[PDB]
């Protein structure tokens, strides 16, 4: 679809076999979400935005369907404020910026 | 155009009568600029993100110039990391999500 960003712009999400909520975030590197329980080994990570670093579990190689398009990438869990898609997964499912 | 997120999209902005880079970033409800020195009132604000929140300074109807695209609107000014367009100014110059 064409998204507009008069509000934000907020897609459903399929991770791990659960529903969830996440914003497409173009200003994102990674994709972080809100914590919750993943199978599969994670190694300790650590992030950086606007208010500083927080720590966070990184799961490589996971599957994630975002508004019915399937990526496989990595995914960062963590005290993040919202879940958020980042670019390593936007590029995934063909996203662009257009105007 | 178009604009591809394999890399931070990254554009050309002038305010205040200075060029400046900036992320065009969905995920940003407002626009967040590098500390700059600029004429007129302000309020001060807080903006949270990922690591927690940083004081900023609120000013009003600012024009932009991104991409030969004008807008005008509220922009913060702050010790953020990097210069942050937001969707209050992406709506101005047309700007939309496309997969
Ligand atoms: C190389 C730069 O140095 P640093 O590592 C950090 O620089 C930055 C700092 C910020 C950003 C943009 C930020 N992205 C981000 O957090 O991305 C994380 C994930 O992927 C990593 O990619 C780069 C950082 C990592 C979001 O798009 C926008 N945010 C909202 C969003 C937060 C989850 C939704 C609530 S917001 O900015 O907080 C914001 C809140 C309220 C506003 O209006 C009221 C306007 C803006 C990009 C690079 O320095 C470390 C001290």
New interface residues.
Partial sequence: ??????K??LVTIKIGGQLKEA???????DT?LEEMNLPGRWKPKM????????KVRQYDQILIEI?G?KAIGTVLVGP??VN?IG?NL??Q???????
């Fill in positions: 679809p064409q998204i507009t960003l008069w934000r712009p914003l497409l975030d173009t200003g994102a590197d972080v992030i950086g935005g606007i208010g500083g670093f927080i508004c398009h993040t404020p958020i670019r936007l590029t499912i063909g996203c662009t910026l257009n105007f």
